[PDB]
Amino acid sequence: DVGVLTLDAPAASALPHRFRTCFFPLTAAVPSREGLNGLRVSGSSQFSLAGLALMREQFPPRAVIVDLRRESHGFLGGNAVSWRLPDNQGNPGRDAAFVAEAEAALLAAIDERPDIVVAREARRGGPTPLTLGPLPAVSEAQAAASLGLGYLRLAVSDHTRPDDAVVERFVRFSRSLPPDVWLHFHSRGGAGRTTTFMTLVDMLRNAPSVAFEDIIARQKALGGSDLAKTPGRDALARQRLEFLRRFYEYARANPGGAPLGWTAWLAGGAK
Amino acid sequence: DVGVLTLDAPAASALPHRFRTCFFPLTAAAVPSREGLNGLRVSGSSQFSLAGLALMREQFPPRAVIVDLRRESHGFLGGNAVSWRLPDNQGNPGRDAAFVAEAEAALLAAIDERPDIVVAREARRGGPTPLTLGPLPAVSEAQAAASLGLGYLRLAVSDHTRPDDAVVERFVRFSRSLPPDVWLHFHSRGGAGRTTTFMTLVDMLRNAPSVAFEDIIARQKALGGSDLAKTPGRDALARQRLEFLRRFYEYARANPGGAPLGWTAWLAGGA
Amino acid sequence: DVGVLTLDAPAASALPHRFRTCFFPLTASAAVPSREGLNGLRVSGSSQFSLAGLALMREQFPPRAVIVDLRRESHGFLGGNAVSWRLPDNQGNPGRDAAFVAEAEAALLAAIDERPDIVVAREARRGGPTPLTLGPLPAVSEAQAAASLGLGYLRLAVSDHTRPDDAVVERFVRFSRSLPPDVWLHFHSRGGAGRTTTFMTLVDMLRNAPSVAFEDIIARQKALGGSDLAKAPGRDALARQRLEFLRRFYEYARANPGGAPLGWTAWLAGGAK
Amino acid sequence: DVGVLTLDAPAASALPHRFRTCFFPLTASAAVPSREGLNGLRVSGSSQFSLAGLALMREQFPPRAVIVDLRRESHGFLGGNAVSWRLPDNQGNPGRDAAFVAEAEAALLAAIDERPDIVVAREARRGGPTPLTLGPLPAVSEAQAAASLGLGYLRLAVSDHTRPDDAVVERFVRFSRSLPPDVWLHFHSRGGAGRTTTFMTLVDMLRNAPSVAFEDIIARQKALGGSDLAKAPGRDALARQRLEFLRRFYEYARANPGGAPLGWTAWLAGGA
């Protein structure tokens, strides 16, 4: 069971939903803004190919698309499509290396073939399905490269916090970035997963100087979701908020991911 | 048998060997035609260290892409570029980039942050005594490129060998999808056969209708590449490669820039 | 009379007031105007920035970005502080083009470069009314400030509270036509309102006038964070002259998409169609 | 006397003569000079370019690149053609700074903008001796040409065949110190030889003087494609004056790496 091939964003869509950068205005009470503008971070929902090209017009030099979707996905023509299991829990427990190979085979099987049936939710032009093809099927990694943009894949399950291995890899990644690299995160809807990692970036820089509640509140006011909003989905949201509180303390004791990493800090009892 | 872990370039290495751009001077033989060469938006080199990549980035234009042509599994252990070398460097034989990416990911994971990792060294790279390294971070080149805000494309080409038809097909489609501002930097292990082959393909896709086959081959050598016209096992592969380049030249003359027909579609029209 | 040396933005200021890009959200006043063609304009605007503010904006500027300075008045930077020479109604270098202004302000900046006891006036809104005494500090033009960051720079002398002269409109239309598809324009004036919003509107019209109503372009440039160009008799006369100009330029842009085939002066010479 | 309007580069010209970056190979004359610190200078140079030539060079320019125009003589573009106003020995705007030059050349360009029958002289090396008759064509400064491509622009008025004035050196050192680590400088003059190589050398010294010998820096800037700053009594005196200045700047850069803690003129005050 590889899931139902489903539409994420039609080829005709432009700027993806929930697009925002750390320079956007805050929509309210209003939390502290200290250290927000300088984070070199933005986020959005899943984009079409045209939407990516549009965003690139305002991307700075040396920008990176950080794909947070553990589920297999890609592009059929300009259409962003994905393979949806129940609760969108594709490739459960799999890392980005496994996911990349699995979704590559799925995309290869629909490349330049007619009569590809793509399901559509009501919010995305449904409920009637969309029949497409023959069209080129490509991964988002290649889509990003075709525009001269960096690409990093981190497998995060929908509605779920990132695994400890994903957090460790991202913190190490963040430390390695030259000062001029810009990160654009995205998930499917640009809400939970996207807002979580924009928050991690915010904490890695500002946790020593900005309150936990202000970071969570301002990432919402920027256009993200409310990570402080917390049975199945509620429990995952509670688990996520607990992780964010624990990561906040980590970032306070290890500004910018140093001197200790995430897993090393946990192994030492979070001293 | 996954091969011997071998050094490609030590962390201390700077600009990789055989680095050149389409703007470099031509070193003569008679000097070939230069029509259409400067405007190709292409460069090439041998395998680089992390420091070497960062140095090259200082002179990369906006929206630059690292095109990794190595079918063999490789990556970075610290700043050191390392690879798993089978006999004749024929790792992952017959495998595509999706298979290679996952296979090398596991290999890199097995040496990540571990002490006493023995890295073989050829005489030309400081050998025959090996290097004992660790604990050091092991990362794929995909992540190394992303950490600098650079694009990354992986195409699995066997050392000493032409690219498979499927690889050619994928690259021509990739080439057609590039906006006019995207820059491609190819590299292999030595920056000779495979690197020069693909710089030649880019040259032909733009200039085959107006520049002679022999001038393209000769000027890619004069830029700092290898001589693809120089052609028992290796000699047969070199002949196969040269014959392929002659066919692609014919394709590119009849289909400027890879249109209207693709590579495999064009092949179907043969006698 | 060269005017009073006045503070535009203190060195400690970060993101300049009224900063917005064509990707920013629209705040309605009235229904939200049409968004067709807005995101793709490759344009942003702001008020006068400090040096630190320019470096901050650069973090989000795309490659090949241009700082378009619309200030006819002489101005520059003393250290990180943005300063200018303000005549009554801020009408410095009246009727002068960018070439004249550049040389004039260059000498003014030279006279305060690395010298102590430079008295800079401050309006209440910019930390006043008490003055600011600075120095010794480096005095540089904005042209050099932009170059020091690898940013393009274009100077167009537009008077405060006033439309751009025909010669300025012609020069900008030609400039616009010459831009490769990847060049980004960031306009700024002193307050990032009238003059900045006028030129963001010109950019908007040059692309969208054939497909978007005049009122929608004016309203959405306001909703982006600019001023209301459709909103003190002498001041009102200039605003009326400006709106009349924008209506005439709209017709120009409808007949000559993107500034072609005819330029602004040629279109006017032909009797507007 | 504002000089003869002369062609620098025709519109059809592509990559300018003597184009090179600090990543280019070194051509030996003598042993190959030291390469330490050369690749990381973020610097390039060339002769005067046409508009098409600038667009071509931009294809390989990194982000945040700056065109540094070292020409004290008035010049600009008539269409795609690079043109200039040449006085005897190309000594236009003698003793004038960039602020004066920019306004003077702006008026000269305005006087030929969109006018027919503009006569542009041509030297033998540039298709002469017969002149070009052009127009109507748009006349723009190089400042605007760079801006139209999203490239930075800095003007430093240096006389042909001559070292930079102390005030120009002071301004450039201050400019260099103010650059973020990602800014790239592309110098150019008319021929990309004396003046261009001089400032590529100044950049080299500001970074590497403490660790690289004076003779290696001079020799490698030539081997990169520049001219020989160590190589007509009047011209010889200027070249000797220029080499002496380069020796003093080398000592300044050794004692003040990167232009700090002392500036150029402040350092000169400490002499005997």
Ligand SMILES: O=P(O)(O)O[C@H]1[C@H](OP(=O)(O)O)[C@@H](OP(=O)(O)O)[C@H](OP(=O)(O)O)[C@@H](OP(=O)(O)O)[C@H]1OP(=O)(O)O
């Ligand atoms: O893509 P959308 O139609 O906008 O749906 C989103 C998306 O969920 P899906 O992937 O199932 O579509 C969000 O998740 P991410 O892809 O950004 O990670 C999710 O966020 P949470 O998992 O945190 O709940 C969000 O839910 P919410 O609105 O509660 O933030 C939900 O939107 P809807 O609930 O409106 O469907």
Ligand SMILES: O=P(O)(O)O[C@H]1[C@H](OP(=O)(O)O)[C@@H](OP(=O)(O)O)[C@H](OP(=O)(O)O)[C@@H](OP(=O)(O)O)[C@H]1OP(=O)(O)O
């Ligand atoms: O990396 P190097 O030590 O510089 O060796 C290179 C490299 O071969 P290896 O990968 O085995 O090292 C070249 O291949 P690419 O990685 O660039 O594809 C190969 O080129 P060919 O495939 O055309 O043989 C070239 O050989 P040649 O000199 O014939 O160009 C060979 O150099 P050596 O013969 O000195 O080992």
Ligand SMILES: O=P(O)(O)O[C@H]1[C@H](OP(=O)(O)O)[C@@H](OP(=O)(O)O)[C@H](OP(=O)(O)O)[C@@H](OP(=O)(O)O)[C@H]1OP(=O)(O)O
């Ligand atoms: O700089 P500010 O303190 O923010 O004041 C601005 C600024 O006026 P000044 O240049 O005199 O400071 C605007 O002008 P620009 O520099 O952007 O061209 C002007 O716009 P107008 O010239 O069109 O009147 C605007 O006025 P408004 O908000 O009506 O657009 C006015 O703001 P205040 O009226 O609040 O002083």
Ligand SMILES: O=P(O)(O)O[C@H]1[C@H](OP(=O)(O)O)[C@@H](OP(=O)(O)O)[C@H](OP(=O)(O)O)[C@@H](OP(=O)(O)O)[C@H]1OP(=O)(O)O
């Ligand atoms: O443009 P070119 O025809 O190539 O001439 C150049 C140019 O002189 P002109 O400005 O008169 O043309 C050089 O000066 P720059 O513009 O680069 O500053 C000059 O260098 P010097 O000022 O050091 O004399 C150089 O002379 P040389 O090559 O001897 O260094 C000379 O080239 P030619 O000597 O071949 O005429």
